[PDB]
Amino acid sequence: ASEVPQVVSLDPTSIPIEYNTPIHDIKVQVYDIKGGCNVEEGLTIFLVNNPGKENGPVKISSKVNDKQVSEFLKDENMEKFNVKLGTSKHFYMFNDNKNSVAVGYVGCGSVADLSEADMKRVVLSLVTMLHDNKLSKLTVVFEINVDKNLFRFFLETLFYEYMTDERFKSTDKNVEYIKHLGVYINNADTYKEEVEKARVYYFGTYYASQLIAAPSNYCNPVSLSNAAVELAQKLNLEYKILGVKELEELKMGAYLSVGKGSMYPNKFIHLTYKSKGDVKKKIALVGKGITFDSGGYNLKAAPGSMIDLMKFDMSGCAAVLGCAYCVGTLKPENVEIHFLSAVCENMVSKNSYRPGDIITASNGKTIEVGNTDSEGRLTLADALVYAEKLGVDYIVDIATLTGAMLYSLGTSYAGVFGNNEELINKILQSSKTSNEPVWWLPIINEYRATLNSKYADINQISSSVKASSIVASLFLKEFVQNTAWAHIDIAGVSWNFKARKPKGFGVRLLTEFVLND
C-alpha cells in the first residue's frame, strides 16, 4: 500500500468500500410449490403470467394453506387485474388466525420465456413495493417458468437494485431492509444451489459499482490499487502492485506516457488466484483502469463528451476486481487467473504527453499519438504485452474504450472482438449463462493500412475510418502475437444513464467464463 498524495488536507486518502451490506443479513429460505404457500408476516408477492393473452386476467394457480387467503385469491377476484409486464397490486386481508397479512402480484406478461431485460422490469416493480414500506420479510411465489440461470439472475438483480449506496451522503438519508426472503418454486431443491451463488455474484457487481461510482478525487491510481491489495488480502490472493520504477524497467512507455500529467503515480495491479489441484487452464483478465479521463490535450470539450461521467473510465478494472471476488470466494479448481489493470489518470499539465508524440511500447513497437483521448489502447497495449509474458491460454480484456459503441450496439449490449473461434464463442456462451448480453463484432483487416504511420511503427488512431471500436481492436491485436485473445468493449453499457448509477457490467460475464472451463 502506498500513501495517497493530496493537494489539501481535506483530500480523501482512501475509497470507502462497504463489505457487509444489508443484503448479506437476509436469511433466504426456499420452499417447493407442491406443498402449499403459507402467507406470513410482511409482503407475499406472486409472479404471474398469461401466455398468449396479451394483458390477460390474473389467475393464481398455487395452493395457499389459508382458507381466508384462498378465498381472496380465487379466480372470481383476480379477474379485475391483468398481467401486463411490470404491473403490480397490493392486497390487505386477514388470515385464518385473524392476523392481517399483505399479498400482491407482479405481472410478467405473456411470452412465457422472459428475457433478461423483461426480468429486470419485473424486478424493478418488485423493488418499488419493497421501497417506502417497512417490511421484515418478502415472499416471492414463482408461477412463471424459469431455468436455473434466470432464477439466479432474478436474485442477483433483486439484491443489486434493492441495495442503496449512501457512502457519500452526509446530511441526506431516510428510512430499512427486510431480514427474510422466501421463495416458492416448482422443483425447489434444484434451484437453491443458485442462492448462495447469486449472493456471491451480487457483491462482485456491487463492489465493482462501488469502485466505479466512487469519484476520481476518491478513486485515483493510488487509492484504487490500495483497494485491490485490501481485497486480495481478505480473499488470500497473491498480489503485486507495480510502481513507476518497475514499469520503467519493463519499458512500458505507452502506459507511462498517459499518466505523466497526473499527480498520482502509475500503479499496475496484478492479482493471482491459483488452484490446489494441478493447473490445466491459465487465464489473464485485463481491465482498463483510467480513474479519470480528461482526454488530455485532446480535452473533452465537445457537448457530447460527457466529461463529468469520466470517473467511469475504470469500469473495466472494476469488472476484473469484481471477478476476483467472485472467483476468490467460490474457488474453482484447475485454473490460474491473473487479474491485471494498468491504472493511471489522463490529465492536462505541463508534464502531460502531447498529440504527435512518438512513444515506445514494451514490445519495441513505436506509436505515434494522434489523439490523447485514445489513451485506453495505449495502456491496454502495455498490459497485453505483460499479460502474454505470463504464459496464459486465454487473454480477455474489458474496457470502456470507444464512445462509438453508443452508435453501434447502444446501451444494452457490449461488443466482443478477438482472434479465435472459441474464446469468442466461450465468451458468447458465458453471456448466455450470465445473462449479461454481448454481441460479436468483426476485426476488419482492411482498415489496418490506415494505421500505417509515416514515422512510427504504427499509428494510434486512424486518419480515415470513423469506426473507432474496430480500429482500436486492430491496434490492440498488434500487441498479442501468439496467444488467443478477446476484447470486450463496455463503453456503452457500463453506466445506467436513466438510473444515474453504474451497472457493474462484466463481473458475472467474466466469472462465468472462468467457471465453465
* Catalytically active residues, by annotation: 300, 377
500 lies in the site for a copy of itself, by CB under 8 A: yes
* DSSP-derived pairing of the beta strands 394-399 and 282-287: parallel
> Which of these ranges, 308-316, 319-327, 350-358, 444-452, lies near Zn ion under the rule CB under 5 A?
308-316
88: exposed, middle or buried (Cβ count in 10 Å: 0-12, 13-18, 19+)? middle
Q: Is residue 290 part of the contact set for Zn ion (CB under 5 A)?
A: yes
Per CB under 8 A, the list member of 59, 89, 137, 251 interacting with a copy of itself is: 251
- Enumerate residues 359-378 that contact Zn ion by CB under 5 A: 373, 375-376
3-state class of 88 per DSSP?
strand
E-strand stretches of 1-87: 27-32, 43-48
52 makes contact with a copy of itself (CB under 8 A): no
Q: Is 7 near a copy of itself (CB under 8 A)?
A: yes
Number of residues that bind Zn ion (CB under 5 A): 6
CA–CA gap between residue 256 and residue 229 (Å, rounded): 21
Is 313 an interacting residue with respect to Zn ion (CB under 5 A)?
Answer: yes
Instruction: Write out the binding residues for a copy of itself, residues 198-227 only, by CB under 8 A.
Output: 213, 215-218
Question: Among 276, 308, 421, 482, which residue sits at the site for a copy of itself (rule: CB under 8 A)?
Answer: 308
Contact 478, 383 (CB under 8 A): no
Is 308 labelled as part of a ligand binding site?
Answer: yes
Residue 397 C-beta: closest distance to Zn ion, Å: 13
Could you tell me the smallest distance in angstroms from the CB atom of residue 292 to a copy of itself? 5
Check the annotation: does 293 bind a ligand.
yes
The CA-CA-CA angle for residues 370, 371, 376, to 5°, reads 115
User: Is residue 288 annotated as involved in ligand binding?
Assistant: yes
Q: How far apart are CA 336 and CA 413, in angstroms?
A: 28
Q: How far apart are CA 121 and CA 157, in angstroms?
A: 10
Interatomic CA distance for residues 274 and 296, integer angstroms: 38
User: Cell numbers at residue 421, please?
Assistant: 473461434
One residue of 366, 419, 425, 429 binding a copy of itself per CB under 8 A: 366
59 is in an annotated binding site: no
The reply to whether 263 sits near a copy of itself by the rule CB under 8 A is: yes
Q: From the list a copy of itself, Zn ion, none, which binds 171 (C-beta under 5 to 8 Å, kind-based)?
A: a copy of itself
Per-residue exposure over 296-320, b if at least 16 CB sit within 10 Å of its own CB, e if not? bbbebeeeebeeeebbbbbbbbbbb
Find out whether 66 is annotated in a ligand binding site.
no
345 binds Zn ion (CB under 5 A): no
Alpha-carbon span 224 to 220, nearest angstrom = 6
382 marked among binding-site residues: no
373 assigned to a ligand binding site: yes
**Separation of CA 469 from chain center:** 20
Among 271, 409, 451, 507, binds a copy of itself (CB under 8 A): 409
276: helix, coil or strand? coil
> 197 vs 311, which CB is nearer to a copy of itself?
311
Nearer to Zn ion, 194 or 345 (CB): 345
176/210 Cα distance (integer angstroms): 20
* Residues 333 and 275: beta-carbon distance below 8 Å: yes
Task: Report the C-alpha gap between 109 and 84 in whole angstroms.
Answer: 5
* Residue 290 binds which entry of a copy of itself, Zn ion, none, CB below 5-8 Å type-dependent: Zn ion
Check the annotation: does 300 bind a ligand: yes
Specify the DSSP element, H or E, that contains 132: none
CA distance 272 to 274: 6
Taking CB under 8 A as the rule, does residue 188 contact a copy of itself?
A: no
Q: Which of 452, 264, 228, 218 lies closest to 341 in space, CA to CA?
A: 228
Contact positions with a copy of itself (CB under 8 A) in 455-474: 455-458, 464-470
Report the residue from 74, 131, 169, 240 that binds a copy of itself according to the rule CB under 8 A.
Answer: 169
Q: Closest Cα partner for 167 from 204, 131, 206, 198?
A: 206
Among 172, 189, 278, 421, binds a copy of itself (CB under 8 A): 172
* Partner from Zn ion, a copy of itself, none contacting 313, C-beta within 5 to 8 A by type: Zn ion
Contacts with a copy of itself: how many residues (CB under 8 A)?
A: 94
Binding residues for Zn(2+): 288, 293, 308, 310, 313, 373, 375
Interaction site with Zn ion (CB under 5 A): 290, 293, 313, 373, 375-376
Binding residues: 288, 293, 300, 308, 310, 313, 373, 375
